[PDB]
Paper text:
S is a large, trimeric glycoprotein that mediates both binding to host cell receptors and fusion of virus and host cell membranes, through its S1 and S2 subunits, respectively. In the prefusion state, the S-protein’s RBD domains alternate between open (‘up’) and closed (‘down’) conformations. The receptor-binding site, which can bind to human angiotensin-converting enzyme 2 (ACE2), is transiently exposed in the ‘up’ conformation.
In addition, A942P was selected for its strong enhancement of protein yields. The S-closed+Fd quadruple mutant was then imaged by cryo-EM. Further processing of the 320,000 closed conformation particles allowed us to obtain a 2.8 Å electron potential map for the closed conformation and a 3.0 Å electron potential map for the 1 RBD-up (one up) conformation. An atomic model that was built into the 2.8 Å electron potential map confirmed that S retains the prefusion spike conformation. The closed structure is highly reminiscent of the one previously solved by Walls et al.. The two structures differ by 2.2 Å all-atom RMSD and there are no significant differences in terms of the relative position of domains or domain conformation. In our new structure, N614 forms two interprotomeric hydrogen bonds with the sidechain of T859 and backbone carbonyl of V860, effectively mimicking the stabilizing effect of the protonated aspartate residue, without the pH dependence. None of the stabilizing proline mutations modify the local structure of the protein, while A892P adds new interprotomeric interactions with the neighboring hybrid sheet, composed of both S1 and S2 strands.
Numbering used by the authors:
A (entry chain A): 722 to 827, 855 to 1147
B (entry chain C): 962 to 1147
C (entry chain C): 50 to 69, 80 to 95, 101 to 108, 116 to 130, 168 to 172, 187 to 209, 216 to 242, 263 to 620, ...
Write the structure that this text describes.
Amino acid sequence: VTTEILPVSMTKTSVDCTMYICGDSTECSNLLLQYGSFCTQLNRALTGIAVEQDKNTQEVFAQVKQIYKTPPIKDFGGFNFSQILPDPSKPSKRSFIEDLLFNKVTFNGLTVLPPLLTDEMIAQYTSALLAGTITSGWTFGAGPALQIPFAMQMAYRFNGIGVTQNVLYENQKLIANQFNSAIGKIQDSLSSTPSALGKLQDVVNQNAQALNTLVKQLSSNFGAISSVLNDILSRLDKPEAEVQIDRLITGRLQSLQTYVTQQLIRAAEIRASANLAATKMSECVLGQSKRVDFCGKGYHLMSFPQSAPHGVVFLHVTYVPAQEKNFTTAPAICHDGKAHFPREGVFVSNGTHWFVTQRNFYEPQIITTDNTFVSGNCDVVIGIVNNTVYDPLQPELDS
Amino acid sequence: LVKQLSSNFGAISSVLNDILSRLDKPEAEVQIDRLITGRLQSLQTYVTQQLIRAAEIRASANLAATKMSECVLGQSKRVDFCGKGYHLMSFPQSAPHGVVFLHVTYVPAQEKNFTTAPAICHDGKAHFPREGVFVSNGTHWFVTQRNFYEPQIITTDNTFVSGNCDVVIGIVNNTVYDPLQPELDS
Amino acid sequence: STQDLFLPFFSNVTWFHAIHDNPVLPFNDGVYFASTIRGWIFGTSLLIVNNATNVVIKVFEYVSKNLREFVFKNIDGYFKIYSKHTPLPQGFSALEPLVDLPIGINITRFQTLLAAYYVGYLQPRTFLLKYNENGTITDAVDCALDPLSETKCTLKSFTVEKGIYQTSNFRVQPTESIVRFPNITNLCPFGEVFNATRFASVYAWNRKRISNCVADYSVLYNSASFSTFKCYGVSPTKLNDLCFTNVYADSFVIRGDEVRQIAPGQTGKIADYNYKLPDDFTGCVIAWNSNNLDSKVGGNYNYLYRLFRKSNLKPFERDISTEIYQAGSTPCNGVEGFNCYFPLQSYGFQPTNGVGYQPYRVVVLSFELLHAPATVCGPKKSTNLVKNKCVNFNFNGLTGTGVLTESNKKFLPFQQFGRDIADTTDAVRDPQTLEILDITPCSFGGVSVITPGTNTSNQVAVLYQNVNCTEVNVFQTRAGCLIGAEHVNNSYECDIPIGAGICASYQTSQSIIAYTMSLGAENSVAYSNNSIAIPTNFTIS
Ligand SMILES: *[C@@H]1O[C@H](CO)[C@@H](O[C@@H]2O[C@H](CO)[C@@H](O)[C@H](O)[C@H]2NC(C)=O)[C@H](O)[C@H]1NC(C)=O
Ligand SMILES: *[C@@H]1O[C@H](CO)[C@@H](O)[C@H](O)[C@H]1NC(C)=O
Ligand SMILES: *[C@@H]1O[C@H](CO)[C@@H](O)[C@H](O)[C@H]1NC(C)=O
Ligand SMILES: *[C@@H]1O[C@H](CO)[C@@H](O)[C@H](O)[C@H]1NC(C)=O
Ligand SMILES: *[C@@H]1O[C@H](CO)[C@@H](O)[C@H](O)[C@H]1NC(C)=O
Ligand SMILES: *[C@@H]1O[C@H](CO)[C@@H](O)[C@H](O)[C@H]1NC(C)=O
Ligand SMILES: *[C@@H]1O[C@H](CO)[C@@H](O)[C@H](O)[C@H]1NC(C)=O
Ligand SMILES: *[C@@H]1O[C@H](CO)[C@@H](O)[C@H](O)[C@H]1NC(C)=O
Ligand SMILES: *[C@@H]1O[C@H](CO)[C@@H](O)[C@H](O)[C@H]1NC(C)=O
Ligand SMILES: *[C@@H]1O[C@H](CO)[C@@H](O)[C@H](O)[C@H]1NC(C)=O
């Protein structure tokens, strides 16, 4: 179980250009009128960014038609999702890991606009996706939700990675124990390491730094006798106060344009990240992905979403092979001058004689006419070996 | 951008000919420099915003190209990349400054509840389905494909054996019809 | 979109009757007029008459179902008239101008000679004009009549699509003005430094330190005794409303035409050898001829200057050195002669000299705008102190606007100002008493207008962003204060996003409703450990 943290949105800001530049002075406002519609462009740009943030959140999290609920009794074949399912005790119906994540990300015309979706709404969406994956699998993302036992779902997914479903049903307890242990280890690795959420904190810090620079830039003279419009106006007459105020306007307008340009660029970056998070919610959560390294490291089984401040955290559950063994193998087998190839798997030998096994989990089986298919004679394949192929009808053919 | 030419930017007029037809070189130069400063700032702003919008449009176009390659020239297993549902095929249609994909998908419908088992015990042997699931309508057990109810008799052809029926959790007892013995008239 | 004096839409125009005598009318910045009355007296002068053949106008003379609509106004004396023959009903009918009188009468009255008529006044009201293809105003929008018209002006359209638009910025206006100067009474002794008997000579210019007083610089630039009275970094006009820490009157007497050397960045004799002002000088220079007493017959050589100096000077340093000046390499050691000069010489001031030669008294008033307590203030009256209200305060000469409150900030006895990240005064100390009060910018925010499409309706809701409803049918969000929306307890798909989970829609007697948006239809999958749902059919989507 591995985490992937993706930023989805950033803070929605608005700046009254005419109030940042000209606080409440009407001399300065009339003097800024003759720069045209720069203020309108700036506000339009920032408003577009702000709308885009809510759009990104919708695209990532609003991927369920209905709000699915987990049953009261959590009998999931030994699998325990208590740490990722919502806690009804808390006022905000958040999971333990979501609470853990939310504790680790910490005028002059500037306002911060609230997001359209509250953290509670996002937590509801995440709980719905979780419940859908737990109760219905990948069906709820492709149509109506169709209930299926969780062990049978995980067998489906095991087949999806090329491992027979007997392998899960015969190791169900071990697989559940491994999963629950890995979730606990996620809990711990997150609660301890401080910079696990560096990406979201970085988004936050970038925004704060930009705003602080913007604000400090009002203490600059830009060539004028003072950085305070009132002092200029309380000391000078109209014709020369106008000169000083024009200097200040030029400077503050340049500063604000720099801010807005940088924010547009960062918003494009964040939009890319949110589109990636949306694709991962569709392909990893609402389905089983064959794409390598797209849903974690290993053969992807299933991902679980968790809300985070301005972002999403995917818990990718993958199958990692282990405890390798060396065998000698062959592409085909000669039997009665016929070349046999494995329908599904490989021919291996422990040294003495030959078996056929599936490629991702050693499960040796007798080489029969059911595990193999014939194509040609045994004089054209490079590496073909001699061995008997057991037809399971002749010894049965007592009649 | 065009309206930004009606702005003075501090000059006495926004019209160069007026400044040139009214003032001599030394001071007309001052006023024209104000106008140049402002109009150049406006043009730089326009170009920067256009670069940013062009980046957005390039991203959208690359997405559309990926969708033409994967949804139209092939059949995609990527969920929600080519419409909602199990994707069958997409068709393109040109549009002003863009493309329109008609995604044809298969959406399951008319669900039915069944009771299921992961495996079946027969002769001390655990049978699992090669392709599909075991279901029961209440009386007999059948094996069907997972996305369309099409029940079939559980045979030794619809299933494979792996182990005994004491390790699978939820295994049920039911007969597995070998299609050789009643056929074995000889 | 123009910004002119218009008749605001849907306003109260008086209706007068003449027959049971024309009544008395005022004339503000402008006037409207209509009728079913030929003539219009003015004054505080102008007169118009229709002899049924040509209009006659006098002051100057000029000659040239009748809803005869008229508009009159005066701007810098120019008197504009507009009118139209409309055959107060509905519709639009723009008024072409007919005449302008470019003379200029101060008008504060209005009359009429000769029925029933109408009168409406004009205010500066930004309008959005709709010129049709044929070039005629066929429609208009008053940008301040209502929120919908403000939205139309902000979008520059007559149709508004459904949505939420921030149209302007709300901010509380000040209730009253405040002035807090120190309780000082003694006048600054300006007559002394100005009417002194003998100003020290330019090489030993004498610097009086005016402090702890009330200076009235009004009388300085009122008196006409000064040939030159010119200030840098400040205007004399506004000197009576500034409070300075202290003033330095550097007085001396100099040559007649070497006066313009007393200014920042100046180079020459007195600048670089005797007295220069810093390039950041903030203060006034006063120079006036002293031929009346200073210069006498025979040569008044009792006023000195320093001719030779080995190098230049700092701003504001004095040299009382009388030591000889050495030009060559041979030491002099106190004896004149070969290359041994005396650096001090004497002005030759006789009334027989030229006009650009007489002695000029020069006093340079240098001001320091430090943050120490202000001692030299202006002749401005202090007022009372008002807290918990947006006011136009003036503490020790620094203006501002905001709400004053009791602060718990621990100013140390030497501090007089708090300061913000943006060099904004966050807190201040009263000069009259000694207490620390916090300054806070009185509430502001954006004003968004929730409107369905103008096709659907014309009523709107208004969102005051990030403000309480107490400083502005009414419903408080975490996005601000909504006005004009009904808060239902239901939950629907979001139509118009307000924020913080709140959406707004036009529906039911249609109205604007504000609700908490729903994420979707609840559902509970019938999950059990031995149940599976399998499809029996499909749709091709
Ligand atoms: C599968 O669904 C289709 C509808 O998508 C069903 O078709 C309809 O059948 C009814 C009566 O049988 C007709 O009145 C409709 O005109 C049919 N519609 C179409 C589009 O063919 C079909 O019967 C369903 N099959 C099953 C087994 O339920
Ligand atoms: C699930 O795990 C939690 C620890 O996170 C534990 O308290 C709880 O008992 C577990 N539930 C089951 C059924 O094992
Ligand atoms: C396979 O044999 C090689 C022999 O060089 C050895 O290095 C390797 O560790 C063996 N692998 C396993 C999984 O035992
Ligand atoms: C190989 O496997 C067979 C059957 O599993 C066993 O009989 C034989 O002893 C094994 N030999 C080696 C070398 O592992
Ligand atoms: C494998 O390599 C050995 C020697 O390295 C050679 O004798 C043998 O024929 C090769 N077999 C195949 C299938 O290439
Ligand atoms: C396999 O058997 C055939 C005949 O049965 C023989 O010709 C061939 O050499 C054998 N191959 C090996 C590797 O022994
Ligand atoms: C399956 O049974 C449950 C019982 O809780 C029921 O709610 C659900 O509608 C059933 N499914 C179908 C497709 O009828
Ligand atoms: C289940 O199906 C079998 C064969 O299709 C039928 O004989 C039996 O009656 C069915 N039982 C129920 C409960 O529908
Ligand atoms: C399913 O749950 C029931 C009780 O709710 C239990 O008796 C049965 O053994 C369970 N079977 C499986 C396969 O979990
Ligand atoms: C299945 O059959 C075996 C013996 O044939 C029996 O021991 C076992 O209890 C049966 N299982 C059930 C669920 O009846």
